[PDB]
Amino acid sequence: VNVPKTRKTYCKGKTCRKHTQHKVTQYKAGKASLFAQGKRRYDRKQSGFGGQTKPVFHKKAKTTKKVVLRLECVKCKTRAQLTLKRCKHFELGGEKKQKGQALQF
Amino acid sequence: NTWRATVQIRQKVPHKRTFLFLEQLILKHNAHVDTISISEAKDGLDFFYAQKNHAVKMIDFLNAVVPIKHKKSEELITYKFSYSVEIVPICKDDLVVLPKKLAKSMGNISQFVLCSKISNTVQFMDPTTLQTADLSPSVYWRAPFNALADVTQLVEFIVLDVDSTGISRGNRVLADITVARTSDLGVNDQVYYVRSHLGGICHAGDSVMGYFIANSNYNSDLFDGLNIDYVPDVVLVKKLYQRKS
Amino acid sequence: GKSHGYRSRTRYMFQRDFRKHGAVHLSTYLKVYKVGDIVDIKANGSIQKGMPHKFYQGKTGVVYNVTKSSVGVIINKMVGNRYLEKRLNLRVEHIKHSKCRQEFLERVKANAAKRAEAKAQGVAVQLKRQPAQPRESRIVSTEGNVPQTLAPVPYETFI
Amino acid sequence: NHTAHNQTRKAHRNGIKKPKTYKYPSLKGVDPKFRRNHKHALHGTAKALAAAKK
RNA sequence: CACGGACCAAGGAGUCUAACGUCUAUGCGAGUGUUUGGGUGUAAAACCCAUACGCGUAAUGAAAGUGAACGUAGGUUGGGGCCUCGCAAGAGGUGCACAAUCGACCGAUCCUGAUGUCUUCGGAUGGAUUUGAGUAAGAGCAUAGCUGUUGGGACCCGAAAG
RNA sequence: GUCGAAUUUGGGUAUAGGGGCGAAAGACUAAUCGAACCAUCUAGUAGCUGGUUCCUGCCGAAGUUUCCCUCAGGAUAGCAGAAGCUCGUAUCAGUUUUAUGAGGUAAAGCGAAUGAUUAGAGGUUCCGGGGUCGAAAUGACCUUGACCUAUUCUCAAACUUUAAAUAUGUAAGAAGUCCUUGUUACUUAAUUGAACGUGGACAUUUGAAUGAAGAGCUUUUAGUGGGCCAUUUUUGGUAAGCAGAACUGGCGAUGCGGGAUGAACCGAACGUAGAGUUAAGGUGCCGGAAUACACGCUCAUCAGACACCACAAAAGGUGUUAG
RNA sequence: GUGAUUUCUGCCCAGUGCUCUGAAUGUCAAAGUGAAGAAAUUCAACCAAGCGCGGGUAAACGGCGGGAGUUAUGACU
RNA sequence: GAAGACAUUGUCAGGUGGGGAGUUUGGCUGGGGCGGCACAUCUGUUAAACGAUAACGCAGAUGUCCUAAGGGGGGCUCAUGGAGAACAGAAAUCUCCAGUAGAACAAAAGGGUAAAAGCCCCCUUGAUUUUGAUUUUCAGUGUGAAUACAAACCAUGAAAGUGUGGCCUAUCGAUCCUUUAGUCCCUCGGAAUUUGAGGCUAGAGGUGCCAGAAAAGUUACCACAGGGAUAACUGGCUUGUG
RNA sequence: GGUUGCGGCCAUAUCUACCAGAAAGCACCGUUUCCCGUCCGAUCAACUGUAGUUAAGCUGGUAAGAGCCUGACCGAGUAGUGUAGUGGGUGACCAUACGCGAAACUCAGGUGCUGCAAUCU
């Protein structure tokens, strides 16, 4: 698959509010996140006793992966996002969604 | 209420192949010497028999010839015996990924492993490295999982350059091939110099069919367990070998 | 399980009448709707955007808001044990104006004029309409013709 | 199992009432420009009447 | 031909509290509650009392904070009742609560930015089919009672188990 | 059955519960052993069986929606009381009518449109899932469809000019109409339109019928959440008191008169007494009531005699009667 | 594990089990060493037994077909 | 005497580990299981003219595919039949005539479409952003989808207008926790700065038993508190001539 | 009344064959520098009313043609169907009473009306 990365569409530049520079990315690998509250508490709960205690989706009914499609602006970066098609499988790259994907005829 | 023996075989594949293969096998074997009737369903076909000896002989022969798990049950109407049979949901050319436990159990083979022989012991070939692995139907039944790939994401390719390496078993294995998408042949600048097992069966400028890994709609879970750094991007399956004369 | 589609069980109704296929005539667009107008609902298969639910054939509503090439209709719905107010957005081509209000206004004007005329002439008049009563005594004279005789017909030779 | 039996009886046990059709429906569900015009018009009418009467 | 019932006498099963929801009664009232405590005593009673503290007299966000009037605290429609007219019929004047609706104001979110500035801080004004359990001459507190809910063994009797 | 041995037994001693013990049976371990007894937690737990103690008056259910690892169980909605609250004839109606809608269901559509079926006959890359495979691609595969090759007919729930009654919606007004002109940031080329306005004209015949035992509004909580039968129309099953669907009625909760008696059938729904008249049903006796009146039919050597219902085919009879 | 007492007691290391006087650079925890960060830390390498490969094992679990091949062929590949 | 800075000894860590400790084995269902998904869905019929309306009934399909098969505008008219035209073949190549749709409109089916919603063209990203209401399966909750308005921006077209994803009916997801993006948004509370963490509308990572536990057998050694057993009446079937 | 332009109603307005339409009006007509498109001025683009035009379209009549549309004391109270019975028949069903009410075929008539502006010895 492919998605456009840099485009001239609606954004929030605080100066234009027009079809101009746009950016977007893909999901990035989960950090070690030692200070993160989630695994911070999960580690102690697991290490207490009883081995595995927190429920785990052992079966393969769920196999989905993550993508991070965002309304990124190179001017500044903070809490934001962009909505696209449901992300069963998505990535980054493409440069206005080319990937040689044009339907030549 | 006069069946007295029911044999049922099921599989969850949208495109059944082993079903028709076993049907051709039994037709050529003329094993339906006592098959009283055959019922057709969209998800598979079932057999009816009146002789318990004939039914058990048929199920034993089917078990010997194709990996299947069998189970029996009784129905009181008076008494009838029913059989449920499950076959491996892996086809001949479906890419399959395995968890770390099975990987280290089967010779520490790479997760990116194909299949090339559907028989009593399910065979597995790694396109990345020439190596043969085998797995038990009972092992698969104890560890049920969905197949990694299917036949719904096949891509045609053209091979330009073939370079040998010197390691093979029976088919001039481990040959580098310069494979390009057939779709973009008019205007393209990207190609793949990938080493595959179709060395002695592929030439220059031939049409092949294979899988695709780079930006394919791939959404597995245990696939995340394998590092992306060791994930090949292009793997071939077969070729068209269109006849001319 | 019984599927409940948005347009299920409507194959016969979601069709244009015979010998009138193709695009719709332009009269349905020129008419004007305002607040208080009484309208009815009837869909058409040429226009697939903004058409109401299958529940709303032959249903009467009131116009309460108008937008560009779209109107709003308020209807009453019977659910459970109470009457609920429903608001629907209907395109122009699926709305039929009701002549009930038109003829009501016509007769209202007529009776207003007749009341004014009665007041002008100076004597009272009756307003309320009345369903027709049975016949009145009359005399049936037969001079150019005479009564004849009728009798039941036998079934013999015909059975 | 599944049946709509006695539904009419249940509905008509206590009677069914109209939605009361309150006059002056709320400006909810109409054009916001229309709402703004309505508010400005009523404000102007109030000003005019207040100036007129004393 | 489902269950229990030979007879008679005696015993016997919606109970009390912690927390409260609705309704009712009572006292006080923008305040309300004496009893943890002290003094007093006919002595487990009743009598008298301070500072605090609970509840409410303001909502809001994630908080740092802000904080509820352009007008006789608004307009539109009815409204019991009251007043004027007239013996009667009726009309007019005012119209609480109440019911719908349009506002106005305060908070959160998104826009726009003037004298100044310690040069990038300060955020007046004016907007936004948005959002709130809000204000718009406050009503709650305290006790008791019926009913009801949650944990208590919880209407009574009852195991195969640990 | 052996009885001089792997015999029996005394007394003492050892092994005490997830343990012991076992020439092995899941046997024994104080009458309890496929985990002993004892006491504590303990009033263990129950979506489960079993009970749940005074009277009368008033009102009066539901076995149906959504969801839940849910089908013997719970919350939401529905009914019912209570507490009431605001007004008290203003506002409405399980109804008809006037006018105005939509529907495609009965029936005969086939010379106004489409058309099978079960019965199996070939065709030269005018062609197809593939087989096991395959040092190749001038490489073998078995079978339906590839191909109707030259052809007949009917209707049907998946189709046809229209098209019924039952059933369903809206309107039948003063919260109106009309006249002049007031408002805006909406719109319009235009005080032109849209909405809401002040003043003025139209009150009992104010805009069909009839009815209204007062109308509207709020909080609330028990029970409820396994139905059956009857009438019509049916679905699958060969047919059925089988499995399952729509309206209304009834039993569930409901007695009373009648069908001798049947939860469901016909009348009729009930405070306590008197008098009268009747419903259905009956009038030889049991049994209250005309061995009434009148018309004609019937001889059975298993007659016959009240609907749902406790019986019935075709056909034969110089039996009889009327055509 | 069979169960005295005679003759024989065939074959097979695919797999699950068991074992090894073989090489290692695959899997690799703790601690330790290196780099960067001011640090909390991330990564790199080496990293034991076992797992893996190969060898042995069947009175250990277990198994002992069909076809071409010539109509039956203990000729027969 | 033998042995030695080796063992053993205490802690941590990896492996083996039914020898043992606790649990589990969905739901619908003409017994259960098997088979199936009637468990989320969609078209018709079942199904009796508002609507709603059962069955483990049938015909059946879904967990996709598309930067174009979307948006705008322009031009053209399809299947088939007939007539033909060196090589031309029953059909390849070109023209004319008839031709209301017998083709095509991604997928199953059914609606709708003829100077278009089809075939071919040129240009674009409206499959935009910020927050509501309404409608459908409904409790008037959400999930799923659609509606046309308002506030800015853009595309196409000369313009009126059209464009808020696929002509329409199905194509899919809460809490907790994780990963990177707007005003460089807020706090880390003795007072400061930087890493780091936790703070927010909407958006991925999923739960297919689809309003979402984390899950393999046997009991005839069984227990347990309960419900059902069972052939004597079909709507009168039942016996002699396919 | 004839047209022409622009429409509303959508076959009473469609197909096959003839017939007629005096300077008022419809279309051909010839041409390519300019704007424009394809293989070409075939359509489209533009250029002017002369030398010729009514053989077209269009406008109207007729066809003892097809079709369509309005009514029927046509087909019928027919088929159907709501309300009721302790109505009949062993049934499949049939009559009865209070209602409502069809349709294919046949016959009768016709082959458009209307809106604004401008032009016509």
Side-chain angles (χ1 to χ4, degrees):
Chain A
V1 309
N2 203 40
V3 290
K5 309 308 289 178
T6 57
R7 288 202 58 82
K8 312 305 159 303
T9 181
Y10 189 79
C11 297
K12 302 299 192 307
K14 287 308 296 175
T15 51
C16 299
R17 298 174 181 259
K18 299 177 184 61
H19 279 7
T20 177
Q21 256 177 337
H22 175 264
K23 305 91 211 179
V24 65
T25 192
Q26 188 260 320
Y27 160 82
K28 297 299 181 180
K31 294 183 176 180
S33 61
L34 309 183
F35 270 101
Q37 199 281 335
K39 63 168 286 295
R40 211 168 179 178
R41 163 181 40 180
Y42 176 83
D43 290 0
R44 63 176 290 100
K45 291 301 299 301
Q46 180 75 5
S47 300
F49 230 96
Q52 213 290 331
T53 64
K54 194 68 62 178
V56 46
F57 205 112
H58 178 272
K59 85 171 303 306
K60 301 299 181 301
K62 56 175 288 179
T63 54
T64 343
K65 62 172 58 180
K66 337 192 185 59
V67 82
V68 175
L69 289 146
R70 61 184 181 189
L71 267 175
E72 181 190 8
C73 185
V74 289
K75 299 165 178 52
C76 175
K77 295 176 298 181
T78 21
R79 161 71 277 199
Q81 198 72 9
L82 176 58
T83 305
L84 287 84
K85 190 254 173 180
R86 184 207 74 266
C87 313
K88 173 76 164 177
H89 180 96
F90 267 149
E91 64 176 15
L92 79 169
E95 303 283 342
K96 303 259 287 180
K97 189 176 167 47
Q98 296 293 341
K99 210 177 80 285
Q101 205 190 4
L103 208 165
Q104 306 87 4
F105 184 83
Chain B
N1 300 330
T2 58
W3 294 274
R4 301 184 66 87
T6 299
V7 180
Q8 296 162 332
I9 166 180
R10 301 304 186 268
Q11 190 177 359
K12 309 304 176 300
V13 53
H15 180 199
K16 312 175 183 60
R17 298 303 306 182
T18 172
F19 268 88
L20 71 109
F21 291 166
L22 67 87
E23 289 301 320
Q24 295 183 2
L25 158 74
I26 59 188
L27 285 180
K28 291 184 177 299
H29 187 280
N30 192 14
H32 312 268
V33 298
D34 304 314
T35 308
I36 84 180
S37 58
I38 302 177
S39 182
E40 300 180 0
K42 61 176 181 58
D43 43 1
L45 75 166
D46 300 333
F47 299 90
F48 287 136
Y49 280 78
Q51 302 296 333
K52 179 166 306 310
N53 46 324
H54 298 171
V56 300
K57 176 184 178 180
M58 266 55 256
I59 196 180
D60 291 331
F61 198 20
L62 193 61
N63 178 29
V65 80
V66 67
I68 47 175
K69 180 61 180 180
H70 62 285
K71 179 172 49 57
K72 62 178 181 179
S73 62
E74 192 279 334
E75 312 182 350
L76 178 57
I77 64 180
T78 58
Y79 306 96
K80 283 182 52 190
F81 285 73
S82 57
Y83 296 105
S84 185
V85 170
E86 299 181 0
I87 201 180
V88 176
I90 301 181
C91 298
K92 303 189 307 302
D93 306 332
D94 290 2
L95 178 62
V96 54
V97 57
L98 306 179
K100 185 177 181 179
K101 178 181 179 181
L102 268 306
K104 65 182 179 181
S105 308
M106 302 305 177
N108 302 270
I109 65 176
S110 180
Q111 321 304 87
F112 198 97
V113 50
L114 289 168
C115 305
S116 63
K117 183 62 160 57
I118 300 301
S119 297
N120 175 269
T121 315
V122 288
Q123 203 261 19
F124 297 95
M125 291 298 302
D126 171 29
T128 303
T129 55
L130 164 61
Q131 204 285 334
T132 298
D134 285 329
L135 184 136
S136 163
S138 56
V139 166
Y140 180 82
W141 303 133
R142 294 291 84 89
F145 49 78
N146 47 12
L148 172 62
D150 201 332
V151 299
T152 60
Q153 269 279 1
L154 268 52
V155 184
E156 191 181 0
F157 286 93
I158 173 181
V159 181
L160 303 180
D161 199 338
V162 179
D163 296 329
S164 59
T165 311
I167 301 177
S168 169
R169 293 184 182 274
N171 38 320
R172 193 185 299 186
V173 200
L174 221 298
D176 264 318
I177 48 188
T178 312
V179 291
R181 292 276 313 276
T182 55
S183 60
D184 58 0
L185 284 181
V187 173
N188 49 9
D189 53 353
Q190 206 284 338
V191 85
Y192 312 93
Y193 296 87
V194 294
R195 50 193 206 182
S196 174
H197 54 267
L198 295 85
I201 56 180
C202 295
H203 296 339
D206 48 3
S207 300
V208 299
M209 184 66 54
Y211 279 94
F212 175 69
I213 300 92
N215 55 260
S216 59
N217 292 250
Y218 240 55
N219 189 255
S220 179
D221 200 327
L222 70 158
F223 177 81
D224 302 67
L226 179 60
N227 66 89
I228 186 60
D229 298 329
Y230 298 150
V231 178
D233 302 332
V234 176
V235 55
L236 295 191
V237 174
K238 200 38 235 191
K239 72 179 309 303
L240 296 184
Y241 52 89
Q242 166 56 38
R243 293 301 308 274
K244 297 184 178 181
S245 179
Chain C
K2 180 179 182 299
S3 174
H4 296 183
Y6 208 1
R7 325 296 176 188
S8 177
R9 312 183 60 178
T10 53
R11 65 180 305 269
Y12 281 103
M13 71 130 315
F14 277 164
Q15 296 190 12
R16 183 66 175 184
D17 300 0
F18 196 65
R19 290 173 186 269
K20 27 216 56 52
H21 274 73
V24 72
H25 62 78
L26 305 187
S27 294
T28 48
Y29 296 166
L30 298 180
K31 40 189 58 60
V32 290
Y33 307 140
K34 285 300 167 176
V35 178
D37 293 335
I38 289 293
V39 293
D40 200 332
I41 319 293
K42 164 57 63 180
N44 185 270
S46 59
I47 296 300
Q48 296 73 10
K49 301 303 179 182
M51 58 93 43
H53 184 242
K54 70 189 64 59
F55 169 76
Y56 297 89
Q57 289 86 74
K59 311 301 295 184
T60 294
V62 298
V63 175
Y64 75 113
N65 79 278
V66 180
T67 55
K68 283 303 180 184
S69 300
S70 301
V71 81
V73 45
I74 287 178
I75 325 184
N76 187 14
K77 177 55 166 289
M78 179 61 253
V79 168
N81 62 331
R82 289 298 179 268
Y83 268 155
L84 301 180
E85 177 180 356
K86 280 284 190 179
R87 301 189 173 185
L88 307 186
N89 304 268
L90 252 290
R91 304 303 304 272
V92 287
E93 82 292 325
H94 295 155
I95 293 297
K96 297 300 297 302
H97 206 355
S98 173
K99 66 190 64 59
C100 68
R101 295 271 75 175
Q102 174 69 17
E103 120 274 300
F104 184 89
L105 293 180
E106 292 184 0
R107 60 163 168 261
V108 159
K109 298 177 180 180
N111 56 64
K114 81 106 172 185
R115 289 195 322 271
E117 181 67 24
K119 296 181 180 301
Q121 54 78 24
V123 322
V125 76
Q126 180 182 1
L127 315 179
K128 335 183 197 64
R129 70 181 183 274
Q130 180 62 29
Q133 311 309 314
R135 269 63 53 179
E136 173 54 42
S137 289
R138 57 204 68 178
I139 307 177
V140 185
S141 180
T142 60
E143 297 183 359
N145 44 17
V146 293
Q148 72 96 46
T149 285
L150 185 54
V153 44
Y155 301 142
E156 295 295 333
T157 66
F158 187 83
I159 311 302
Chain D
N1 184 19
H2 293 279
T3 167
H5 187 213
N6 291 6
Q7 175 71 20
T8 61
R9 174 196 54 78
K10 297 184 300 179
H12 288 261
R13 270 188 293 184
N14 298 12
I16 308 180
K17 308 303 176 178
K18 299 178 179 178
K20 285 82 59 179
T21 176
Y22 294 148
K23 85 157 195 179
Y24 289 177
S26 178
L27 295 183
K28 160 68 220 316
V30 310
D31 155 58
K33 305 194 305 173
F34 175 85
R35 298 195 287 270
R36 287 178 282 271
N37 298 294
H38 197 158
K39 71 160 69 60
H40 288 338
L42 58 89
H43 194 65
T45 53
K47 284 188 172 180
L49 60 89
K53 59 97 184 180
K54 186 178 181 179

